[PDB]
Amino acid sequence: AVGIGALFLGFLGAAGSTMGAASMTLTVQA
Q1: 13 class by beta-carbon count within 10 Å (0-12 exposed, 13-18 middle, 19+ buried)
Q2: How far is CA 29 from CA 15, 16, 23, in A?
Q3: Which of 28, 7, 30, 9 lies closest to 20 in space, CA to CA?
Q4: Cα 2 from Cα 9, distance rounded (Å)
Q5: What is the DSSP code string of 1-30?
Q6: What are phi and psi for residue 28, nearest 5 degrees?
Q7: Residues 6+ apart with CB under 8 A from 5
Q8: CA angle, corner 12, sides to 24 and 26, nearest 5?
């Protein structure tokens, strides 16, 4: 139950966190 699922979650959480910074870290939302 939710065994290997842990490996995709671990790396797929890098893509969202990296593409979120390109959201203009100035002050505008997105």
Answers
A1: exposed
A2: 19, 15, 8
A3: 30
A4: 10
A5: --STHHHHHHHHHHHHHHHTTTS-SSS---
A6: -60, 150
A7: none
A8: 10
- Find how far residue 8's CA is from the centre of its chain: 12
Amino acid residing at 6:
A
Both tokens assigned to 6: 């842990």
Q: Are 3 and 10 within 8 A, CB to CB?
A: no
Exposure b/e, 20-30, CB count within 10 A at least 16 = b: eeeeeeeeeee
